[PDB]
Design an enzyme around this catalytic site. Structure first.
Site, PDB file in Angstrom:
ATOM      1  CE  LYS A  30      -3.761   2.251   2.517  1.00  0.00           C
ATOM      2  NZ  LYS A  30      -4.665   2.168   3.671  1.00  0.00           N
TER       3      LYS A  30
ATOM      4  NE  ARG B 155      -3.089   0.896  -3.552  1.00  0.00           N
ATOM      5  CZ  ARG B 155      -3.877   1.666  -2.827  1.00  0.00           C
ATOM      6  NH1 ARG B 155      -4.338   2.809  -3.299  1.00  0.00           N
ATOM      7  NH2 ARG B 155      -4.222   1.277  -1.622  1.00  0.00           N
TER       8      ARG B 155
ATOM      9  CG  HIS C 284       3.443   7.184   0.025  1.00  0.00           C
ATOM     10  ND1 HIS C 284       2.890   8.443  -0.041  1.00  0.00           N
ATOM     11  CD2 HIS C 284       2.870   6.579   1.041  1.00  0.00           C
ATOM     12  CE1 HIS C 284       2.011   8.577   0.927  1.00  0.00           C
ATOM     13  NE2 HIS C 284       1.978   7.447   1.599  1.00  0.00           N
TER      14      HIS C 284
ATOM     15  CE  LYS D 280      -3.398   9.941   1.325  1.00  0.00           C
ATOM     16  NZ  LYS D 280      -2.376   8.903   1.270  1.00  0.00           N
ATOM     17  N   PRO D 281      -6.774  14.393   0.427  1.00  0.00           N
ATOM     18  CG  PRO D 281      -7.173  15.167   2.611  1.00  0.00           C
ATOM     19  CD  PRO D 281      -7.355  13.972   1.704  1.00  0.00           C
ATOM     20  CB  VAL D 282      -1.946  16.095   2.011  1.00  0.00           C
ATOM     21  CG1 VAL D 282      -0.457  16.425   1.924  1.00  0.00           C
ATOM     22  CG2 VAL D 282      -2.760  17.318   2.444  1.00  0.00           C
ATOM     23  CG  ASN D 283      -0.312  10.493  -1.642  1.00  0.00           C
ATOM     24  OD1 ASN D 283      -0.340   9.777  -0.621  1.00  0.00           O
ATOM     25  ND2 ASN D 283       0.226  10.111  -2.789  1.00  0.00           N
ATOM     26  CB  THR D 284       4.522  12.846  -0.356  1.00  0.00           C
ATOM     27  OG1 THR D 284       4.050  14.020   0.302  1.00  0.00           O
ATOM     28  CG2 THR D 284       5.937  13.061  -0.866  1.00  0.00           C
TER      29      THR D 284
ATOM     30  CE  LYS E 109       2.380  14.862  10.585  1.00  0.00           C
ATOM     31  NZ  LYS E 109       2.368  15.168   9.146  1.00  0.00           N
TER      32      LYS E 109
ATOM     33  NE  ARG F 192      -2.916  22.209   1.102  1.00  0.00           N
ATOM     34  CZ  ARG F 192      -2.482  22.022   2.354  1.00  0.00           C
ATOM     35  NH1 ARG F 192      -1.327  21.417   2.590  1.00  0.00           N
ATOM     36  NH2 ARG F 192      -3.220  22.426   3.375  1.00  0.00           N
TER      37      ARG F 192
ATOM     38  CG  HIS G 254       2.485   6.876   8.030  1.00  0.00           C
ATOM     39  ND1 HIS G 254       1.406   7.623   7.579  1.00  0.00           N
ATOM     40  CD2 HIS G 254       3.138   7.675   8.905  1.00  0.00           C
ATOM     41  CE1 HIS G 254       1.422   8.817   8.164  1.00  0.00           C
ATOM     42  NE2 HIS G 254       2.453   8.868   9.005  1.00  0.00           N
ATOM     43  CG  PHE G 255       5.398  10.093   2.957  1.00  0.00           C
ATOM     44  CD1 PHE G 255       5.228  11.427   3.355  1.00  0.00           C
ATOM     45  CD2 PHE G 255       6.489   9.759   2.160  1.00  0.00           C
ATOM     46  CE1 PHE G 255       6.125  12.415   2.943  1.00  0.00           C
ATOM     47  CE2 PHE G 255       7.433  10.742   1.806  1.00  0.00           C
ATOM     48  CZ  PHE G 255       7.228  12.070   2.177  1.00  0.00           C
ATOM     49  CG  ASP G 256       4.812  10.954  10.383  1.00  0.00           C
ATOM     50  OD1 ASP G 256       3.591  10.623  10.428  1.00  0.00           O
ATOM     51  OD2 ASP G 256       5.453  11.471  11.335  1.00  0.00           O
TER      52      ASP G 256
HETATM   53  C1  LIG Z   1       1.831  15.301   5.839  1.00  0.00           C
HETATM   54  C2  LIG Z   1       1.730  14.290   4.705  1.00  0.00           C
HETATM   55  C3  LIG Z   1       0.845  13.275   4.658  1.00  0.00           C
HETATM   56  N1  LIG Z   1       0.786  12.403   3.619  1.00  0.00           N
HETATM   57  C4  LIG Z   1      -0.243  11.291   3.601  1.00  0.00           C
HETATM   58  C5  LIG Z   1       0.106  10.102   4.485  1.00  0.00           C
HETATM   59  C6  LIG Z   1      -1.248   9.583   4.921  1.00  0.00           C
HETATM   60  O1  LIG Z   1      -1.727   8.701   3.930  1.00  0.00           O
HETATM   61  C7  LIG Z   1      -2.145  10.833   4.932  1.00  0.00           C
HETATM   62  C8  LIG Z   1      -2.494  11.411   6.283  1.00  0.00           C
HETATM   63  O2  LIG Z   1      -1.267  11.469   7.084  1.00  0.00           O
HETATM   64  P1  LIG Z   1      -1.086  12.478   8.302  1.00  0.00           P
HETATM   65  O3  LIG Z   1      -1.208  13.908   7.787  1.00  0.00           O
HETATM   66  S1  LIG Z   1       0.660  12.141   9.138  1.00  0.00           S
HETATM   67  N2  LIG Z   1      -2.391  11.825   9.340  1.00  0.00           N
HETATM   68  C9  LIG Z   1      -2.603  10.582  10.072  1.00  0.00           C
HETATM   69  C10 LIG Z   1      -4.103  10.439  10.234  1.00  0.00           C
HETATM   70  C11 LIG Z   1      -4.576   9.090  10.689  1.00  0.00           C
HETATM   71  O4  LIG Z   1      -4.435   8.216   9.565  1.00  0.00           O
HETATM   72  O5  LIG Z   1      -4.508  11.439  11.173  1.00  0.00           O
HETATM   73  C12 LIG Z   1      -4.424  12.703  10.529  1.00  0.00           C
HETATM   74  N3  LIG Z   1      -4.728  13.792  11.494  1.00  0.00           N
HETATM   75  C13 LIG Z   1      -4.181  13.758  12.774  1.00  0.00           C
HETATM   76  C14 LIG Z   1      -4.396  14.746  13.661  1.00  0.00           C
HETATM   77  C15 LIG Z   1      -5.209  15.885  13.283  1.00  0.00           C
HETATM   78  O6  LIG Z   1      -5.481  16.854  14.002  1.00  0.00           O
HETATM   79  N4  LIG Z   1      -5.713  15.852  11.986  1.00  0.00           N
HETATM   80  C16 LIG Z   1      -5.511  14.858  11.047  1.00  0.00           C
HETATM   81  O7  LIG Z   1      -6.002  14.922   9.922  1.00  0.00           O
HETATM   82  C17 LIG Z   1      -3.024  12.991   9.956  1.00  0.00           C
HETATM   83  O8  LIG Z   1      -1.462  11.843   4.110  1.00  0.00           O
HETATM   84  C18 LIG Z   1       1.665  12.462   2.547  1.00  0.00           C
HETATM   85  O9  LIG Z   1       1.692  11.691   1.632  1.00  0.00           O
HETATM   86  N5  LIG Z   1       2.568  13.481   2.599  1.00  0.00           N
HETATM   87  C19 LIG Z   1       2.693  14.372   3.632  1.00  0.00           C
HETATM   88  O10 LIG Z   1       3.553  15.243   3.528  1.00  0.00           O
END
Ligand SMILES: Cc1cn([C@H]2C[C@H](O)[C@@H](CO[P@](O)(=S)N3C[C@@H](CO)O[C@@H](n4ccc(=O)[nH]c4=O)C3)O2)c(=O)[nH]c1=O
Lengths: 122, 121
Positions: free
Chosen positions: A7, A10, A12, A39-43, A64, A83, A117-119
């Site tokens: 996953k 797929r 990242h 999906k709002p944000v993805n790298t 995080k 984004r 997971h990508f943090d």
């Molecule tokens: C920041 C970031 C995230 N991502 C992707 C990885 C994950 O598929 C997805 C959400 O990751 P996070 O932002 S670390 N993610 C984890 C989620 C529980 O699954 O919880 C979310 N959360 C936690 C606290 C909060 O207040 N709001 C919120 O939306 C944040 O976004 C990514 O690909 N690139 C990035 O730079």
């Protein structure tokens, strides 16, 4: 069926290009990140799998979410951030493509110990 | 700046666990070819916990004459990376050699952890 590791790949990995304005529009769709919602944000990371998998033995950092199983790349990597735009309405998910060279932070798990997971990027 | 413990982990720890190109790839990924080719470097293929434990093993003198060095009671899986004779920056080239040897590290700080790789024996 789909492992955590698969996953991660797929969502990242995009080794096939080293860095299109419509990259994100295409890739978010093709990797099934717009299926149930936008999906709002993805790298996406433009390095080899071996290079990204190696990060699990690099700089241990806090995740995080407060877990301790995150790792920051010693080298910068070529990445693309996708984004969701303000005018994006499912199912026509639209994205801004931003290319960067940054360190990545991934959570790793398992045996073998691999990214799941990508943090963040820094 | 980078802590000594962190520098040790970057330069000497590879708990992932082998291509003949291993050293070439590693010396690059750990930033050991940036300004110059670091000529010699050892990577340890044990858990961080196992390597940290060496700080409570056999106390020995260090090569610099301080006495905060420790030899691992057990042998460990290591890779020795040594630059080839024809290696020339920025195309750093290394011979990779796998080995199973005791390691000697300097320990410092709180927690009391490895801060320097002294030797394999
Ligand atoms: C920041 C970031 C995230 N991502 C992707 C990885 C994950 O598929 C997805 C959400 O990751 P996070 O932002 S670390 N993610 C984890 C989620 C529980 O699954 O919880 C979310 N959360 C936690 C606290 C909060 O207040 N709001 C919120 O939306 C944040 O976004 C990514 O690909 N690139 C990035 O730079």
């Amino acid at each position: 069926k789909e492992t955590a590791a698969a996953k991660f790949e797929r969502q990242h990995m995009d080794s096939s290009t080293s860095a299109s304005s419509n990259y994100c529009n295409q890739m978010m769709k093709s990797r099934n990140l717009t299926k149930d919602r936008c999906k709002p944000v993805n790298t996406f990371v433009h390095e080899s799998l071996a290079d990204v998998q190696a990060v699990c033995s690099q700089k241990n950092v806090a995740c995080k979410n407060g877990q301790t199983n995150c790792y920051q790349s010693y080298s910068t990597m070529s990445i693309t951030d996708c984004r969701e735009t303000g005018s994006s309405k499912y199912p026509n998910c639209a994205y801004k493509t931003t290319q960067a060279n940054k360190h990545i932070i991934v959570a790793c798990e398992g045996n073998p110990y691999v990214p799941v997971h990508f943090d963040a990027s820094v």
